Curated annotation (Swiss-Prot), chain A:
Name the record gives this protein: Large ribosomal subunit protein bL36B
Induction (free text): Expressed during stationary phase in minimal glucose medium, induced by EDTA, strongly repressed on shifting from minimal glucose to minimal glycerol medium (at protein level). Induced under zinc-limiting conditions in stationary phase; repressed by the zinc uptake regulatory protein Zur.
Keyword Oxidoreductase: no
InterPro entries from the UniProt entry: Ribosomal_bL36, Ribosomal_bL36_sp, Ribosomal_L36_bact
Organism, scientific name: Escherichia coli (strain K12)
One GO cellular component, as annotated: cytosolic ribosome
Top-level taxon of the source organism: Bacteria
Pfam families in alphabetical order: Ribosomal_L36
GO biological process: translation
Any one GO molecular function term: structural constituent of ribosome
Coiled coil: none
Keywords per UniProt: Ribonucleoprotein, Ribosomal protein, Stress response
Curated annotation (Swiss-Prot), chain B:
Organism: Escherichia coli (strain K12)
UniProt modified residues of type N6-succinyllysine: 38
PROSITE patterns: RIBOSOMAL_L3
Name of the protein: Large ribosomal subunit protein uL3
Keyword Ribonucleoprotein: yes
Function: One of two assembly initiator proteins, it binds directly near the 3'-end of the 23S rRNA, where it nucleates assembly of the 50S subunit.
GO CC terms in record: cytoplasm; cytosol; cytosolic large ribosomal subunit
Gene Ontology BP annotations: cytoplasmic translation; ribosomal large subunit assembly
Subunit record text: Part of the 50S ribosomal subunit. Forms a cluster with proteins L14 and L19. In pull-down experiments interacts with CedA.
Name of encoding gene: rplC
Superkingdom to which the source organism belongs: Bacteria
Presence of the UniProt keyword Metal-binding in the record: no
Curated annotation (Swiss-Prot), chain C:
UniProt keyword GTP-binding, yes or no: no
Taxonomic superkingdom: Bacteria
Cited PANTHER family: 50S/60S RIBOSOMAL PROTEIN L14/L23, LARGE RIBOSOMAL SUBUNIT PROTEIN UL14M
Pfam families: Ribosomal_L14
Entry GO MF terms: large ribosomal subunit rRNA binding; structural constituent of ribosome
Protein name per Swiss-Prot or TrEMBL: Large ribosomal subunit protein uL14
Function: Binds to 23S rRNA. Forms part of two intersubunit bridges in the 70S ribosome. In the 3.5 A resolved structures L14 and L19 interact and together make contact with the 16S rRNA in bridges B5 and B8.
PROSITE patterns hit by this protein: RIBOSOMAL_L14
SMART domains: Ribosomal_L14 (SM01374)
Family assignment from sequence similarity: Belongs to the universal ribosomal protein uL14 family.
Subunit description: Part of the 50S ribosomal subunit. Forms a cluster with proteins L3 and L19. Forms two bridges to the 30S subunit in the 70S ribosome, contacting the 16S rRNA. In pre-50S ribosomal subunits interacts with RsfS, which may inhibit association with the 30S subunit.
Disulfide bridge map: none
Swiss-Prot record, chain D:
Subunit-structure text: Part of the 50S ribosomal subunit.
Domain of life: Bacteria
PROSITE patterns in the record: RIBOSOMAL_L6_1 (PS00525)
Cellular component GO terms, alphabetical: cytoplasm; cytosol; cytosolic large ribosomal subunit
GO biological process, any: ribosomal large subunit assembly
Name of the protein described by the UniProt record: Large ribosomal subunit protein uL6
Function field: This protein binds directly to at least 2 domains of the 23S ribosomal RNA, thus is important in its secondary structure. It is located near the subunit interface in the base of the L7/L12 stalk, and near the tRNA binding site of the peptidyltransferase center. Gentamicin-resistant mutations in this protein affect translation fidelity.
Naturally occurring in which organism (per UniProt): Escherichia coli (strain K12)
Family annotation (InterPro entries): Ribosomal_uL6-like (IPR000702), Ribosomal_uL6-like_a/b-dom_sf (IPR036789), Ribosomal_uL6_a/b-dom (IPR020040), Ribosomal_uL6_bac-type (IPR019906), Ribosomal_uL6_CS (IPR002358)
GO molecular function, a single term: large ribosomal subunit rRNA binding
Family stated for the protein in its record: Belongs to the universal ribosomal protein uL6 family.
Modified residues (N6-acetyllysine): 43
Keywords associated with the record: Acetylation, Antibiotic resistance, Ribonucleoprotein, Ribosomal protein, RNA-binding, rRNA-binding
RNA sequence: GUGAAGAGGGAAACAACCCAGACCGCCAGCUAAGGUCCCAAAGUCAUGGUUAAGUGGGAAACGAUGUGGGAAGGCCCAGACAGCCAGGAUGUUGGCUUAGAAGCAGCCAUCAUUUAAAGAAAGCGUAAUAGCUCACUGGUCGAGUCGGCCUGCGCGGAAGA
RNA sequence: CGAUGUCGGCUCAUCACAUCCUGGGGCUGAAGUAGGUCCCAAGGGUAUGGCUGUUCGCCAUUUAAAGUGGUACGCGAGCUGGGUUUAGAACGUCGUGAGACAGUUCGGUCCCUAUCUGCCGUGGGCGCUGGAGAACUGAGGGGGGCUGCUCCUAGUACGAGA
RNA sequence: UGCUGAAAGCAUCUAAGCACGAAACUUGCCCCGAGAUGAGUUCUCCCUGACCCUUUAAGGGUCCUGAAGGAACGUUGAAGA
């Protein structure tokens, strides 16, 4: 998956693209066409 | 299981029916005799205390004697403890001979290593030597820089430096056991074990595979 | 007990006569090559019309050394000099077709079987 | 909340039992017990269970909806029960049950032996078909996925363990 | 203006910031800045709210159904939102720009009928078919649902010996 | 400025992680083998040489890899003295000249018996509540933590095949 | 990477609940280690006379006693400046 500090775009690359707040990061899931996944963050410190 | 205390006799070799020469350390194991059993109630843990050998009456202090007397066993050259594995049980004055290793394939062997005195970093820490020529002034076996500069302004604890080498406890692991013979009090293990001839050894079945 | 700069005689009809070892193969920081081990060589002398030339760079296996070989009962077999057999760089198979002087059974390494068959004496 | 506010009818035969937050639901097809989140108050009157939040807990309704859903499928468990079918795809892939162990041949050196937890039972009607049956809907799901995980479907030939209901899209290899 | 040439209190430590200008003595009292759970002198004070990030206790463009308050609006029991059942037809296998083309690439236009609606298309895909789904509408459910505005506190953005 | 010795080497290292190898994972324009790209991860490991004073770099050949950086561009009361700033000499160039160059070239003195702190070892003293001999428990601290090739599974999955 | 699962009828690995997951972490291996003044445990061994003085208190002193053990001297050591 790719990272990104912005999902405005990666959220709309596909109809099944969702956006979820797992732990405390925002993931863009898309379990049909995975290549479109992203996150906004990258862990604690 | 428990181990035994022994004496390092020396090294030799065993030749095999088909041409292999196995180098062996000869470890002497006289009966190890139990002088005290420790349990959870009285001691918080389970272990046996053993002696082996013999000691000069005139060299046995009065405390020592009261202690052996409780067990009803004769003075020994010393005392050593071995932890028990629940269900393991022994009784005061019971004798343990070396046949305990009869079917243990490898043992860890513990000893007090030969003493090399104040040793320099080349021999003690395998430091590499500086130039023997090419203008070196008085600085062939010396250690080199031992730190950085203003920052941190100190030597870090643990610095490998010169000092006492040897005369310490060393454990060698997973030696093949080549022969056991109680009739002669012998245990042969493959390879070298720590220490000089004469010194006491601890043999324990090997904790690893 | 071969290293960089070591010179070796040659136990075959490859045309080489003197080679220098320029790399001991088989591990980072590896110090010494021995019987059976592969080294990299440059050719320092060759005959006029052989399979290789002065300055050629290849691989070769050591088959005799002065440090010798230990056998499992403690014996030692030592030779009066250090020799190798040149091997094509990629196939690591012998260039030459004949082998000279005794070799050792340490060679029963599959790939170098051809060397023991060709070898006069085997120790 | 739309889910919390929806009562679950407990049919003739199912026995509800409540002790604070600890629910127990016994039926013709087993007995499951679950502990509901503190913030959930559950009530049992008529032949129905109804759910609602509890004063002082900021998220009772979300909790209550979770609670509702769970019990709905607990009751289904000890009545109708749940079935997850997986199937193997690929040459040499086979499976079989002996007692409570599913034996998976999945192109590895060692075959795979998969133990099963209590409540899940297995049957292969075919060397290439695994039917799990069980009352804990979570447990059949964990198991069904554990088995699927030994060899996830691959995208070029669909080979592997898949949920029978599953959509596996294949793709073409990289042109040369 | 302060240091310089100014002590005392605060700002952990810190000439130059805040409070404040030390003739001397006191085991009295009110204050200032700044403080009142412990180290550590004074509220574990009352009261009404936010925040769940130890944010508080480092940092931007930008990101997001985090959550608080406010004022409007659109749709909706002539049944909305989501979900699920349906269909998604005919001029027309679309003429035609390039070697296919049947919306199937690019430029041009973007007409038309049967209807409950159905785009000379929405984009996956492509030998042509394609065989997917949707845009849009009929059914089912049954009461809410949508996303802009003013604003509070927070989230991510955030790696160094 | 009543003195903090400069480049490079050698010895010796210690840290960050913006990771070179090895470990784990997402995507891939990933068939496989092998790659690309990101995420996690700092445990350990992480080239010898030809040339030049070099660091670097080019080359040769290895390797799993030959990591990027902090550390007075770490480390001269630890060593070197090859580069670079004394004095000698020359070339080129500049100047009428003395001399000059931040251009080249040949030669050209590197101290310090460790008080304190720090560190490596090693004893003395007193304590731990009458003294003494042992054997222990284990709060805590340290060390260790690298990887190659080949065999099988298997010439199997995969692949038109190779 | 997943199960179950709501807020949000759907979806959703997470909000409650739950399965996995790496040389990093805690252990497991070796060494030191009760000055661990938080000075721990166990076993054994040894000491069973009076008197004076003052500021009468865990006071000072005298006589007689002198253990267990520790050291000392000596012969030494694959232990060691
Ligand atoms: Mg997580
Ligand atoms: Mg010695
Ligand atoms: Mg000198
Ligand atoms: Mg010298
Ligand atoms: Mg210095
Ligand atoms: Mg300091
Ligand atoms: Mg102050
Ligand atoms: Mg005044
Ligand atoms: Mg106070
Ligand atoms: Mg609807
Ligand atoms: Mg000075
Ligand atoms: Mg990182
Ligand atoms: Mg590996
Ligand atoms: Mg060199
Ligand atoms: Mg040369
Ligand atoms: Mg420097
Ligand atoms: Mg010097
Ligand atoms: Mg403990």
């Amino acid at each position: 998956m790719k990272v990104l500090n912005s999902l405005r775009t990666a959220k709309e690359r596909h109809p099944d693209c969702q956006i979820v707040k797992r732990k405390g990061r925002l993931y863009v899931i898309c379990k049909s066409n995975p290549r479109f996944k992203a996150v906004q963050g990258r862990k604690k410190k | 299981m428990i181990g035994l205390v022994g004496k390092k006799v020396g090294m030799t070799r065993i030749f095999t029916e088909d041409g292999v020469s196995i180098p062996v350390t000869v470890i002497e194991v006289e009966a190890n005799r139990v002088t005290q059993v420790k349990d959870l109630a009285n001691d918080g843990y389970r272990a046996i205390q053993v002696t082996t050998g013999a000691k000069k009456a005139n060299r046995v202090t009065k405390p020592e004697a009261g202690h052996f007397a409780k067990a009803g066993v004769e003075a020994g050259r010393g005392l050593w403890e071995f932890r028990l594995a629940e269900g393991e049980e022994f009784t005061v004055g019971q004798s343990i001979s070396v046949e305990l290793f009869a079917d243990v394939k490898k043992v860890d062997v513990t000893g007090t290593s030969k003493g090399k005195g104040f040793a320099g970093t080349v021999k003690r820490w395998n430091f590499r030597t500086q130039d023997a020529t090419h203008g070196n002034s008085l600085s062939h076996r010396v250690p080199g820089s031992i730190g950085q500069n203003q920052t941190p302004g100190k030597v870090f604890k643990g610095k490998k430096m010169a000092g006492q080498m040897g005369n310490e406890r060393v454990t060698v692991q997973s030696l093949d056991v080549v022969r056991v013979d109680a009739e002669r009090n012998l245990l042969l293990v493959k390879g070298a074990v720590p220490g000089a001839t004469g010194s006491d050894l601890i043999v324990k079945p090997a904790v690893k595979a | 007990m071969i290293q960089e700069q070591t010179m070796l005689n040659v136990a075959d009809n490859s045309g080489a006569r003197r080679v220098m070892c320029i790399k001991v193969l088989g591990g980072s920081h590896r110090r010494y090559a021995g019987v059976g081990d592969i080294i990299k060589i440059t050719i320092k002398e060759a005959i006029p019309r052989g399979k290789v030339k002065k300055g050629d760079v290849l691989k070769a296996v050591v088959v005799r050394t002065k440090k010798g070989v230990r056998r499992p009962d403690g014996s030692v077999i030592r030779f009066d000099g250090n020799a190798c057999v040149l091997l094509n760089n990629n196939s690591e198979q012998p260039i030459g077709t004949r082998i000279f002087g005794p070799v050792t059974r340490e060679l029963r390494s599959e790939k170098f079987m051809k060397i023991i068959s060709l070898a006069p004496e085997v120790l | 909340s739309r889910v919390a506010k929806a009562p679950v009818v407990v049919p003739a035969g199912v026995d509800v039992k409540i002790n604070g937050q600890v629910i127990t639901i016994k039926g013709k097809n087993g007995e499951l017990t679950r502990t509901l989140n503190d913030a959930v108050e559950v009530k049992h009157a008529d032949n129905t269970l109804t759910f609602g939040p509890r004063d002082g807990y900021a998220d009772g309704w979300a909790q209550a909806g979770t609670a509702r859903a769970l019990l709905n499928s607990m009751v289904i468990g000890v009545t109708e029960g749940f079935t997850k079918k997986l199937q193997l795809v690929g040459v040499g892939y086979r499976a079989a049950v002996k007692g409570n162990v599913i034996n998976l041949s999945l192109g590895f050196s060692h075959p795979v032996d998969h133990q099963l937890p209590a409540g899940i039972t297995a049957e292969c009607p075919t060397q290439t078909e695994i039917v799990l049956k069980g009352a804990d809907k979570q447990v059949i799901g964990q198991v069904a996925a554990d088995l699927r995980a030994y060899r996830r479907p691959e995208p070029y030939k669909g080979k592997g363990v898949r949920y029978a209901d599953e959509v596996v899209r294949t793709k073409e290899a990289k042109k040369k």
